[PDB]
RNA sequence: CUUUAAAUCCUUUAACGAGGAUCCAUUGGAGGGCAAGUCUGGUGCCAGCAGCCGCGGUAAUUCCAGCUCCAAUAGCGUAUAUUAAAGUUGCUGCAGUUAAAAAGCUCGUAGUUGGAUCUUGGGAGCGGGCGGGCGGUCCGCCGCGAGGCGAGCCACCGCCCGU
RNA sequence: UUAGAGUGUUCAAAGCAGGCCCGAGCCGCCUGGAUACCGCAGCUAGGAAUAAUGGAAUAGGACCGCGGUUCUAUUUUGUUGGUUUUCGGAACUGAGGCCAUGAUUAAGAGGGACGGCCGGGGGCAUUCGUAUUGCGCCGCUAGAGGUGAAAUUCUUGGACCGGCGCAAGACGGACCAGAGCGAAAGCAUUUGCCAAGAAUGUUUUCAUUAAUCAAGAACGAAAGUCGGAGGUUCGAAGACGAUCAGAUACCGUCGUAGUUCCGACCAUAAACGAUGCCGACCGGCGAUGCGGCGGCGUUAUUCCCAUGACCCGCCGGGCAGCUUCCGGGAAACCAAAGUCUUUGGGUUCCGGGGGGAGUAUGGUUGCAAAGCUGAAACUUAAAGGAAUUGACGGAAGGGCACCACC
């Protein structure tokens, strides 16, 4: 059930150079089409303005209306949905605001009740969203 | 524990194995003589013949090869295993 | 067919030791196999054996003893550069305290402890413990 | 090969060792070498000993010094 | 097991351990060496020559009583066949089947067995060609082959 | 004063310089994994929390806060790339009847692997050396210079055991 | 830089620095800053077990032997200067020699021959058996088919039934089995013919010729396609009659393609043992097929004898079976799915959570149907295997109850 020979080092090698492609944890990270469809250019964060403010429901077991934002990036000009993670911190978000967006916490997947949103908002017009909540900073009006 | 000698088995267990599976292999055939019915020129003949033999002393067939052992037409003196 | 005629003999005794027999016969013979079993017998792992002779090959009978636990073979015949020997006897042996691995060598076939004193290496054959 | 005049093409087998596995991997690299035009009776498939030289041509560097196989061949 | 039809068959002969003259009928090598020629001249492959010496004359083995086996004897005198005795017959079966194959076309069994047999022959050619028994420029054709054989 | 082209900081001696908010310690948690509240007020499948399992419809151990405790401590959470975990890329080291999985079967060139066999045997040989019962000894006791023992500093010898 | 030795940078991270001895009287001393590691490839030299590889088979090693041609000089009277010899060597060449004169064995590897068989193995011809449908003739009658019940259907133009024949196309029942062969798909009427094959039996031959297998090639049930001939039965599509609320379904009467045959395409099936090939080993037992062997009686013959048929056993190779805690496994199960942390006999293909998908596109084969090769975006927390308890069954086996029936 193996090669195991002593002049076979090439076949053990051109087999594993072939069967690595079926490890989806490796096919994604080593094929140019996986990163291309990423709205980020592989970056950690990406700035971009806010072009509306919309809410999205939750999955079947538990009901709610998660609040979100329709952020358009400036890097690629794409359009993505960004969750606004905080308690009632949709009062500081406004149209044409240039918010900073980060990965949601599952390396390119949804999390929990939120359907189809993989992005959360960390800053809002160059002030930290945590700072606005706890009050340390203040967004000038 | 089924601990039995594979070196010194009975001369009668050795016939309970194939021609090849014995201690030291040896053929199951035996070279035999035949007295050539009607004459006294005694010829050799191999027990597991695969060919007929015809006797000038008989002008009739002597051994008939059938299966994997010979059958002799008429009885004769049969020495054996002088080898 | 038969390729590693050392491997088949060792599996023939290993399967016969597991059952609990006292004697076992192996079908082919060789200096490689005779000089092998002598290494075991020089440690007392087995009893005292006989080597039936023919014109064809020879067939060894061994008087097994209840002292060896497993008698493996390792193929392909690798190399042991005497810096890998300490790796081998730690991922292929039960412990350092006992058990030996036999590796062929420019000075005959000998278990690894012999190799250290004679300060040499060479290809590897198998192991027991 | 006993192709283009005054030079021959020689295969050269050898083993390359892969580090990851403890196993070898056969390769080969075949190169052109000049010849001594003294020679008919240089068959193919036979060993030869070759020496280095100044760059005789675009791909002719090594040159032939003495051929080494006639016994394993036909009539005396 | 076999090489083309499955089954670990086992019916081979078994030489005795004793390597001596029979000592019931010597008829020493002078007779046998000059005797084999009569059978080989009369026309019998080295495969069948052993039978008649064994079955009626009485010989343990030609390799025992004489010096060398039945081909090395026939090699020196000049009575070695044109083609090796195993190859010659393999062509016969390859030729007779092809003869039957050109008539009973839909006989799919023959059209298969012919593929095995041409594979057996081409395997023996690539072995003999190394051992110089057959010339390098030899080639089995399946058309020019029946003219080599009766 | 010292440092150094020139100053800068550490280092050395000055004059001051701590009573609880003076000289005020954080970043994340308290359902499980995973250390720590079946504590109080609010909210009522709302707000929201939650990497995952999940909490929220009147007694919320999970939300928002207060108090008490827990983790790391001038550091600590978040995002993504990456390694170990991974015996889930497996040469050491995976699996293939049913859990994804063996070409319908055979032939077969490259490629990989390939039966057995050329002292698998000794000498009171000769001698050197480790430990070892030994016969001997310079040697150590013992003795009356008529004598008794061989191992224990020093080892020596002909010899055996130890692969 | 990794490791590491020496050293009190106040410690350490670091750094290759530093320690004495005295006011200084020496017109200074002692030192440091090393070592290992650094594959693969190249060079060198000891070792020669294992693994490649070599040598005299239609003559080759050995003996300073005695012979020829052809030449290259060293230096002796000619110091140098031209000429002849011998020796030494080199090239090809004449007789016999000393070789113990050169060929390991023949594998529970393989090819091949040989002998008596064996098999629903393959092809071609030949032959038979009933059955079905159709028809001719004769008989008697009013119903015949068909379903759960009927109706379309069949007859006043004599159906179904009964008898004697004629024609056609399919198919081989009963024998027929956990029995046989084939690589697999698969194969069952008597006879003949052509060629092949496993297994046994062998004191025959060759002497490693062999295992596995990318690319490639032959065969590949059913269905389907292309042309010719035939079309009995069955019968996708189709038209009807039924049941149903609907029933373009199951059910019933018709019926095209098709089914069978010869010549080519197609290359797919739960083509299944859902279980690669070759090789070795580890338990018993009663049987089955073929071959050979040993057997005491019987039966076919008047005679062991040739030989069958029975009856007792052995051996090899098969299809398979029962049992066991050898041992595996998630377990159902397994003499392989065992010899697996105590892992390594050799080799081929292939899987990495489920879905999108065997989809799109690209290449390629195909007359067409389609086959081979074959992604990603996105989505999802579970898909999935074996057993255990219940529940449930328009699932069978027992049994009870007027909240059940007769």
From Swiss-Prot, chain B:
Specify the species: Oryctolagus cuniculus
Record's GO cellular component, any one? postsynaptic density
Known partners and oligomeric status = Component of the small ribosomal subunit. Part of the small subunit (SSU) processome, composed of more than 70 proteins and the RNA chaperone small nucleolar RNA (snoRNA) U3.
Q: Which cysteines are joined by disulfide bonds?
A: none
Compartment list: Cytoplasm; Nucleus, Nucleolus
Positions where Phosphoserine occurs in the chain: 10
Biological process terms from the Gene Ontology for this record are: ribosomal small subunit biogenesis; rRNA processing; translation
What family is it from? Belongs to the eukaryotic ribosomal protein eS27 family.
Molecular function (GO) terms for this protein are:
structural constituent of ribosome; zinc ion binding
Q: How is the cofactor bound?
A: Binds 1 zinc ion per subunit.
- Name of the protein this chain belongs to: Small ribosomal subunit protein eS27
Where Zn(2+) binds, per the record, is at 36, 39, 55, 58
Q: Which cofactor does it need?
A: Zn(2+)
C4-type ZnF: 36-58
Compositionally biased tracts (Basic and acidic residues): 1-15
Region listing for Disordered, in residue ranges: 1-22
Per the entry, what this protein does is:
Component of the small ribosomal subunit. The ribosome is a large ribonucleoprotein complex responsible for the synthesis of proteins in the cell. Required for proper rRNA processing and maturation of 18S rRNAs. Part of the small subunit (SSU) processome, first precursor of the small eukaryotic ribosomal subunit.
Provide the alphabetized UniProt keywords.
Answer: Cytoplasm, Metal-binding, Nucleus, Phosphoprotein, Ribonucleoprotein, Ribosomal protein, Zinc, Zinc-finger
Swiss-Prot record, chain C:
Could you tell me which SUPFAM superfamilies the record lists for this protein? Answer: Ribosomal protein S8
Protein name (database record): Small ribosomal subunit protein uS8
Q: Which PANTHER family match?
A: 40S RIBOSOMAL PROTEIN S15A
Q: Which HAMAP family match?
A: Ribosomal_uS8_A
Which BP terms does GO give this entry? translation
Sorted alphabetically, the keyword list is: Cytoplasm, Nucleus, Ribonucleoprotein, Ribosomal protein
Query: What family classification does the UniProt entry report for this protein?
Result: Belongs to the universal ribosomal protein uS8 family.
What organism does the UniProt record list as the source? Answer: Oryctolagus cuniculus
Q: What are the subcellular locations of this protein?
A: Cytoplasm; Nucleus, Nucleolus
Function statement: Component of the small ribosomal subunit. Part of the small subunit (SSU) processome, first precursor of the small eukaryotic ribosomal subunit. During the assembly of the SSU processome in the nucleolus, many ribosome biogenesis factors, an RNA chaperone and ribosomal proteins associate with the nascent pre-rRNA and work in concert to generate RNA folding, modifications, rearrangements and cleavage as well as targeted degradation of pre-ribosomal RNA by the RNA exosome. Required for proper erythropoiesis.
Molecular function via GO: structural constituent of ribosome
Q: How does it assemble?
A: Component of the 40S ribosomal subunit. Part of the small subunit (SSU) processome, composed of more than 70 proteins and the RNA chaperone small nucleolar RNA (snoRNA) U3.
- Name a GO CC annotation attached to this entry: ribonucleoprotein complex
Q: Is Ribosomal protein set as a keyword in this record?
A: yes
Indicate where the modification N6-succinyllysine is found in the sequence: 87
UniProtKB/Swiss-Prot annotation, chain D:
Native species of this protein?
Oryctolagus cuniculus
- Spell out the family assignment given in the record's similarity comment: Belongs to the universal ribosomal protein uS17 family.
* Assembly and interaction partners: Component of the small ribosomal subunit. Part of the small subunit (SSU) processome, composed of more than 70 proteins and the RNA chaperone small nucleolar RNA (snoRNA) U3.
Quote the PTM field: Citrullinated by PADI4.
Physiological role: Component of the small ribosomal subunit. The ribosome is a large ribonucleoprotein complex responsible for the synthesis of proteins in the cell. Part of the small subunit (SSU) processome, first precursor of the small eukaryotic ribosomal subunit. During the assembly of the SSU processome in the nucleolus, many ribosome biogenesis factors, an RNA chaperone and ribosomal proteins associate with the nascent pre-rRNA and work in concert to generate RNA folding, modifications, rearrangements and cleavage as well as targeted degradation of pre-ribosomal RNA by the RNA exosome.
Put simply, this protein is called Small ribosomal subunit protein uS17
A GO term, aspect molecular function: structural constituent of ribosome
Keyword Transcription regulation appears in the UniProt entry: no
Keywords tagged on the record: Acetylation, Citrullination, Cytoplasm, Lipoprotein, Methylation, Nucleus, Palmitate, Phosphoprotein, Ribonucleoprotein, Ribosomal protein, RNA-binding, rRNA-binding
The biological processes this protein is annotated with in GO are:
translation
Subcellular localization, as worded in the UniProt entry: Cytoplasm; Nucleus, Nucleolus
Residues that the record marks as modified (Phosphoserine) are 32
User: Can you supply one Gene Ontology CC term for this chain's record?
Assistant: cytosolic small ribosomal subunit
Swiss-Prot record, chain E:
Q: CDD domains given for it?
A: Ribosomal_S15p_S13e (cd00353)
Q: What does the UniProt keyword field contain? A: Acetylation, Cytoplasm, Isopeptide bond, Nucleus, Phosphoprotein, Ribonucleoprotein, Ribosomal protein, Ubl conjugation
Q: Which residues form a coiled coil?
A: none
Residues with PTM Phosphoserine:
29
Could you tell me what this protein is called?
A: Small ribosomal subunit protein uS15
- Note the PANTHER family from the entry: RIBOSOMAL PROTEIN S15P/S13E, SMALL RIBOSOMAL SUBUNIT PROTEIN US15
- Name the Gene Ontology molecular function terms of this record: small ribosomal subunit rRNA binding; structural constituent of ribosome
- UniProt cross-references to Pfam families, sorted A to Z: Ribosomal_S13_N (PF08069), Ribosomal_S15 (PF00312)
